[PDB]
Amino acid sequence: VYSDVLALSMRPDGKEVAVSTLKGQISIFNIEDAKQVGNIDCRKDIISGRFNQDRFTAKNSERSKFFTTIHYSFDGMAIVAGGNNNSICLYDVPNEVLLKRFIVSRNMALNGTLEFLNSKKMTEAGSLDLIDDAGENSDLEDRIDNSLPGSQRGGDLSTRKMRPEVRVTSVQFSPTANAFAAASTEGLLIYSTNDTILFDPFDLD
Amino acid sequence: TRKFGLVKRTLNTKKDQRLKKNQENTRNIPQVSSALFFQYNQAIKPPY
Amino acid sequence: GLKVPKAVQKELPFKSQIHQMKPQKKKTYMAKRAVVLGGDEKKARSFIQKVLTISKAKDSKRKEQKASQRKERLKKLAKMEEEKSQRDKEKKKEYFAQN
Amino acid sequence: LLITGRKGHVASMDWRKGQLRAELFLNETCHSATYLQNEQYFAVAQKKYTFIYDHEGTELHRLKQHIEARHLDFLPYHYLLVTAGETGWLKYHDVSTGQLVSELRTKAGPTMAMAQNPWNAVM
Amino acid sequence: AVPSVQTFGKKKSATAVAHVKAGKGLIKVNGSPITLVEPEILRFKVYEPLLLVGLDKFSNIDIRVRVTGGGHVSQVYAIRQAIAKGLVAYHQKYVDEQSKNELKKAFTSYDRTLLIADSRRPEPK
Amino acid sequence: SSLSDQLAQVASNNATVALDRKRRQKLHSASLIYNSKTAATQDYDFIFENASKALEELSQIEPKFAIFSRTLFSESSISLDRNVQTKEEIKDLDNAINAYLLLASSKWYLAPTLHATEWLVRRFQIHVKNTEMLLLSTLNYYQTPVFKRILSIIKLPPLFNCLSNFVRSEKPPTALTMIKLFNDMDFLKLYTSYLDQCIKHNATYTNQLLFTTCCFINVVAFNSNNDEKLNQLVPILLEISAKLLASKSKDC
Amino acid sequence: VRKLKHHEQKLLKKVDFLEWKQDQGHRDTQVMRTYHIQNREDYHKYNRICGDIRRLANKLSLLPPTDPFRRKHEQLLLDKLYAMGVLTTKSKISDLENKVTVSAICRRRLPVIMHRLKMAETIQDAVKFIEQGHVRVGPNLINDPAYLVTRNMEDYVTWVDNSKIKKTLLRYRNQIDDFDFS
RNA sequence: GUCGACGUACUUCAUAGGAUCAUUUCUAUAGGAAUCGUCACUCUUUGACUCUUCAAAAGAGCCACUGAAUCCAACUUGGUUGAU
RNA sequence: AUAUUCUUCAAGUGUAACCUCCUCUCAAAUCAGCGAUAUCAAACGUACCCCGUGAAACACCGGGGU
């Protein structure tokens, strides 16, 4: 394949393999042959956050424009992908076009949400979020910064000295009822269609 | 437009002049005497 | 001189890539322009190249003369170092023969 | 004049004329500061560690001691920087030698208010 | 300046350095047109990136290709690789993106060896 | 705004206030006649002797300077600093000095006005406080060596930003750069309010009143293309020439 | 202050405003410069760990030598402190008290490793490239300069793909390939 | 087969006489020079501050209004009785 | 002094005062010396014709040129 692949998944047919490379693009291979059926392009329709401590625009950072998971539906006709970005996708497999894009969360508290930070936070020396408000707090137990220096995704949430990142780690479809669960930073999401407040007719006269 | 790799300005010790230990910062060949021979020393005469 | 194979010369790290200037073939405009003073200046430009040849070789022979007598002097010097090595052993028996 | 932001300013302005000696942006919180012995050497009370700065904005010392400092004061005939933070203790730091003179257990809890006595140098 | 894109093409030990720039529609190989490639039976093996996608998409571009190494055949697999890569990496740069995924799906269904180097690294059993 | 922008705004308001000795040895050292080393070593008492001796010569040339020896050039007006006095009293010190630089500007080639204004420079700080009426009174002497000295002191106002490359320059400010001054629409509105102030005292002299028009002609000349620029220009120029015809003087 | 005179000297034999015994030679600044580390408290955030190595080294030295706990237990630890790469060799058991220094743990920092692997020219310039976002570890790019990197993970630092600084490198060898959009 | 005994051979072990700096006076010695509320000028060293080269990289992003500088187009003036 | 306050002395593998060694000296990189594969120019060397000097020497005098 072209770049580093990560997070494979196989169709329940047993005849196709869906890949998520680092260039963003998701490719669909055959197994009995080595050739590929097609690939679907995922670098554009991924929403990426600018973090608070960043120095680049959210448009041209290469943090989150790939997909660190993929899971075929049990129909074998749709892929749900999710990575360290803010967004989840639903690609159609034959027609090769995404269906709907889901923003996982809208929190200023988490880092990877905003495409564009506010400008009034930027004081001449630095963002007004990176300033430690920890010493202002009334209790002792809040003020004690025990964060290790470069601990990323570490043991406790205190040991970051950063806001938690937005990432959707692993995504699977449900077996039963058109649901799929994406495991987020905020916690495991569940999307569904159990409403059916929708007029989806078939063969009306 | 703030610069990258900024760091808190702090005191150089190997370079600063205000420190006590760092406050500090023509050949000469004496002619062998016009009296002297190789070792004889031809000038000394009594009285000594 | 040593001639590095080009397959070695190609995958070298950037710090050490050997600078080998290709010869120029198409005549430059500047090498068709510049004036060379001939006649009297040629007799006074041959001569400076004839003096600096002498003073480079008179140095590099006399500078070789020192490192010829450097080699002789340290052989004479180590012989005096060896006598002060062995005889210093003999005193520290004749000292500790008393003790 | 010396001022400190609760978030990050420390500005050691000359005040009558318009000159500006040092402007330090500290991303730790800061509570109070005084000039110690001249206009030249001042001492902020950071998030945890009272620092000792110079007229340019240089650090001169990261005081390992003085481990909380809400209220900070100097008294000028003894060269004796005094702190009393949210830890109860009361520490006097003889800033000419650098030798901490006396560390005093207050026994009464977090020091809510401190101000020197000029005539007497008791506090 | 001049919009260009450089792509490589590699078979057995033959490289293929295809500069692609916006131009008038000439396609050269080693300072010679592409209608004069040597093996004369495998000339349609290098007309594949011309004729698969359609010869209209070469009307505005130049394809300067120079090759070294290889043999008679294993250079023809290098110029068909670097023209396919040099065409499909100019539409993602200086022309439209939806052109590129039309091309990358066109060369794929025909022969994937046009794009990625089929590296026949050994296997021990 | 930032901190250092606001904290340099305090510096302009205390530009004259002598605080340290080094602040005094920079302010007092600049003057019209003496160089920078010999100026700092002399009292106001020394300067007042040379001024009041010179000012009595100007009173002989015309009697109008006799009044200023009662108020500004008097012996009691050595102790008064500007900075100590109230806001109403400073505007009267300006309105004396503004009335002074009208009478001073005419006799400006002469040596005694150079020794006369210098005490009014060095004691009354007119090279910092009111340098508009200092420069507008002496704007016609740009070729002379006395205006080259006047440039070598003054922190230039925001309206005279055309001359800002000629401060402490070798050669005098050239004739076209004087036009780039008058080409501005705001700098003319001074030179109206300077002239209508200057006509009311009926002391407008011949060489001055030429250099007004010889700039006011060229401003019409440089703007002869832009018909919008001329349309906004004649509330400035024709209101002068209306008031310039009301003069008793035939020369105006 | 003044270069005080000879009679001023003997009364002020001990005063100094810049250098204190509390301040401990300014060792913390002196190694903050050599490795260019951003925030000040980062040193003593390591030097609490690097001291905690020696306190576990000391009490494990106070056990008797033929104890199959003690023989197992520091060799269990030197496995980890070498995998993380703070110490050069695994053989000596007294590296664990003598060679465990902060400057040892402060050179498995990411910008030092980008200067060791000759990625950036200097060590300040590597902080300049991390903060701008050109470097990555495997999938995800890394943005804290002060990322500790395991000796095992030291294999995987590269320039982030399609960057303007990995594009310039490939132009020097005349080996770009814009199908990668390098 | 290895280890003693003896013989041989090499390696190694003790330094002393002064002077100064070391204690917030005083290193122990009277054989040693230093107690002053400063005002200027010169010269040198170091530090910021604004641009900036080897030499890049990244832009807290987008709009609206007003101001300026450069570069052509145009016009005017000077210019083969000599512009650069 | 009439259980606390104050005072004297003793003891503590008591010590966030105070002494001391470590918490620096890199599986690093630059700049300076040195200097190779190379390059441009000039001179000099070999052969070849030409010009001056000279009365003249296939000139043993100088010069130019390829």
PDB file of N, CA, C and O in Angstrom, chain E residues 4-8 19 85 88-89 92-93 104 115, chain G residues 167 170-171 173-182:
ATOM      1  N   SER E   4       5.420  22.570 -11.709  1.00  0.00           N
ATOM      2  CA  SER E   4       5.898  21.254 -12.093  1.00  0.00           C
ATOM      3  C   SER E   4       5.597  20.247 -10.995  1.00  0.00           C
ATOM      4  O   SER E   4       5.278  20.601  -9.862  1.00  0.00           O
ATOM      5  N   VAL E   5       5.704  18.976 -11.356  1.00  0.00           N
ATOM      6  CA  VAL E   5       5.566  17.869 -10.420  1.00  0.00           C
ATOM      7  C   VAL E   5       6.475  16.748 -10.895  1.00  0.00           C
ATOM      8  O   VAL E   5       6.482  16.392 -12.074  1.00  0.00           O
ATOM      9  N   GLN E   6       7.296  16.235  -9.991  1.00  0.00           N
ATOM     10  CA  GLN E   6       8.269  15.203 -10.317  1.00  0.00           C
ATOM     11  C   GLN E   6       7.864  13.885  -9.689  1.00  0.00           C
ATOM     12  O   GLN E   6       7.697  13.809  -8.472  1.00  0.00           O
ATOM     13  N   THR E   7       7.704  12.847 -10.500  1.00  0.00           N
ATOM     14  CA  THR E   7       7.424  11.532  -9.951  1.00  0.00           C
ATOM     15  C   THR E   7       8.404  10.529 -10.516  1.00  0.00           C
ATOM     16  O   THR E   7       8.954  10.714 -11.598  1.00  0.00           O
ATOM     17  N   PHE E   8       8.568   9.435  -9.794  1.00  0.00           N
ATOM     18  CA  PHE E   8       9.509   8.390 -10.144  1.00  0.00           C
ATOM     19  C   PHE E   8       8.793   7.159 -10.657  1.00  0.00           C
ATOM     20  O   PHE E   8       7.605   6.975 -10.414  1.00  0.00           O
ATOM     21  N   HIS E  19       9.308  14.634 -15.087  1.00  0.00           N
ATOM     22  CA  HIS E  19       8.864  15.979 -14.763  1.00  0.00           C
ATOM     23  C   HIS E  19       7.601  16.260 -15.555  1.00  0.00           C
ATOM     24  O   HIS E  19       7.573  16.028 -16.763  1.00  0.00           O
ATOM     25  N   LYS E  85       2.219   7.868 -12.711  1.00  0.00           N
ATOM     26  CA  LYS E  85       2.402   8.603 -11.468  1.00  0.00           C
ATOM     27  C   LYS E  85       2.543  10.092 -11.711  1.00  0.00           C
ATOM     28  O   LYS E  85       2.075  10.891 -10.902  1.00  0.00           O
ATOM     29  N   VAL E  88      -1.082  11.438 -12.385  1.00  0.00           N
ATOM     30  CA  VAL E  88      -2.012  11.418 -11.267  1.00  0.00           C
ATOM     31  C   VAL E  88      -1.473  12.211 -10.081  1.00  0.00           C
ATOM     32  O   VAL E  88      -2.148  12.351  -9.061  1.00  0.00           O
ATOM     33  N   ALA E  89      -0.254  12.731 -10.168  1.00  0.00           N
ATOM     34  CA  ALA E  89       0.221  13.616  -9.114  1.00  0.00           C
ATOM     35  C   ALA E  89       0.273  15.052  -9.574  1.00  0.00           C
ATOM     36  O   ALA E  89       0.829  15.900  -8.879  1.00  0.00           O
ATOM     37  N   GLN E  92      -3.630  16.165  -8.436  1.00  0.00           N
ATOM     38  CA  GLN E  92      -3.865  16.473  -7.036  1.00  0.00           C
ATOM     39  C   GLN E  92      -3.149  17.742  -6.644  1.00  0.00           C
ATOM     40  O   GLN E  92      -3.430  18.302  -5.584  1.00  0.00           O
ATOM     41  N   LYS E  93      -2.212  18.203  -7.461  1.00  0.00           N
ATOM     42  CA  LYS E  93      -1.510  19.417  -7.083  1.00  0.00           C
ATOM     43  C   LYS E  93      -2.120  20.639  -7.749  1.00  0.00           C
ATOM     44  O   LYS E  93      -2.636  21.528  -7.068  1.00  0.00           O
ATOM     45  N   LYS E 104      -7.016   7.671 -10.535  1.00  0.00           N
ATOM     46  CA  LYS E 104      -6.493   6.624  -9.676  1.00  0.00           C
ATOM     47  C   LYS E 104      -7.438   5.435  -9.622  1.00  0.00           C
ATOM     48  O   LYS E 104      -7.011   4.321  -9.326  1.00  0.00           O
ATOM     49  N   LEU E 115       0.967   2.273 -10.827  1.00  0.00           N
ATOM     50  CA  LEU E 115       1.142   3.229  -9.746  1.00  0.00           C
ATOM     51  C   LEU E 115       2.217   2.805  -8.761  1.00  0.00           C
ATOM     52  O   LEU E 115       3.251   3.464  -8.651  1.00  0.00           O
TER      53      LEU E 115
ATOM     54  N   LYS G 167      10.005  17.907   2.588  1.00  0.00           N
ATOM     55  CA  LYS G 167      10.030  18.152   1.159  1.00  0.00           C
ATOM     56  C   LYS G 167      11.367  18.734   0.737  1.00  0.00           C
ATOM     57  O   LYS G 167      11.857  18.436  -0.354  1.00  0.00           O
ATOM     58  N   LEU G 170      14.202  16.030   0.577  1.00  0.00           N
ATOM     59  CA  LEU G 170      14.160  15.194  -0.611  1.00  0.00           C
ATOM     60  C   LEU G 170      14.533  15.954  -1.876  1.00  0.00           C
ATOM     61  O   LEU G 170      14.866  15.325  -2.881  1.00  0.00           O
ATOM     62  N   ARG G 171      14.495  17.283  -1.858  1.00  0.00           N
ATOM     63  CA  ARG G 171      14.966  18.030  -3.016  1.00  0.00           C
ATOM     64  C   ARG G 171      16.480  18.077  -3.076  1.00  0.00           C
ATOM     65  O   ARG G 171      17.043  18.274  -4.156  1.00  0.00           O
ATOM     66  N   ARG G 173      18.575  15.603  -2.429  1.00  0.00           N
ATOM     67  CA  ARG G 173      19.061  14.416  -3.109  1.00  0.00           C
ATOM     68  C   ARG G 173      18.450  14.244  -4.483  1.00  0.00           C
ATOM     69  O   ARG G 173      18.721  13.227  -5.126  1.00  0.00           O
ATOM     70  N   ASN G 174      17.647  15.217  -4.923  1.00  0.00           N
ATOM     71  CA  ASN G 174      16.930  15.205  -6.194  1.00  0.00           C
ATOM     72  C   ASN G 174      16.047  13.966  -6.299  1.00  0.00           C
ATOM     73  O   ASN G 174      16.010  13.296  -7.327  1.00  0.00           O
ATOM     74  N   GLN G 175      15.350  13.652  -5.208  1.00  0.00           N
ATOM     75  CA  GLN G 175      14.587  12.422  -5.070  1.00  0.00           C
ATOM     76  C   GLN G 175      13.209  12.673  -4.486  1.00  0.00           C
ATOM     77  O   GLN G 175      12.726  11.874  -3.687  1.00  0.00           O
ATOM     78  N   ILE G 176      12.557  13.770  -4.862  1.00  0.00           N
ATOM     79  CA  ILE G 176      11.169  13.947  -4.464  1.00  0.00           C
ATOM     80  C   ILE G 176      10.295  13.018  -5.279  1.00  0.00           C
ATOM     81  O   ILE G 176      10.702  12.490  -6.315  1.00  0.00           O
ATOM     82  N   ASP G 177       9.077  12.816  -4.805  1.00  0.00           N
ATOM     83  CA  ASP G 177       8.109  12.002  -5.524  1.00  0.00           C
ATOM     84  C   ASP G 177       6.725  12.501  -5.142  1.00  0.00           C
ATOM     85  O   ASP G 177       6.156  12.029  -4.154  1.00  0.00           O
ATOM     86  N   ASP G 178       6.160  13.405  -5.943  1.00  0.00           N
ATOM     87  CA  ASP G 178       4.913  14.024  -5.518  1.00  0.00           C
ATOM     88  C   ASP G 178       3.714  13.127  -5.667  1.00  0.00           C
ATOM     89  O   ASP G 178       2.611  13.596  -5.394  1.00  0.00           O
ATOM     90  N   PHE G 179       3.860  11.873  -6.078  1.00  0.00           N
ATOM     91  CA  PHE G 179       2.761  10.958  -5.852  1.00  0.00           C
ATOM     92  C   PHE G 179       2.614  10.642  -4.375  1.00  0.00           C
ATOM     93  O   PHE G 179       1.504  10.380  -3.906  1.00  0.00           O
ATOM     94  N   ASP G 180       3.703  10.706  -3.616  1.00  0.00           N
ATOM     95  CA  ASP G 180       3.600  10.740  -2.166  1.00  0.00           C
ATOM     96  C   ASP G 180       3.160  12.100  -1.650  1.00  0.00           C
ATOM     97  O   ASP G 180       2.833  12.210  -0.464  1.00  0.00           O
ATOM     98  N   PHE G 181       3.105  13.096  -2.535  1.00  0.00           N
ATOM     99  CA  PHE G 181       3.126  14.534  -2.247  1.00  0.00           C
ATOM    100  C   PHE G 181       4.059  14.867  -1.089  1.00  0.00           C
ATOM    101  O   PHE G 181       3.698  15.530  -0.123  1.00  0.00           O
ATOM    102  N   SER G 182       5.295  14.411  -1.233  1.00  0.00           N
ATOM    103  CA  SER G 182       6.377  14.778  -0.353  1.00  0.00           C
ATOM    104  C   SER G 182       6.759  16.228  -0.576  1.00  0.00           C
ATOM    105  O   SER G 182       6.071  17.136  -0.127  1.00  0.00           O
TER     106      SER G 182
END
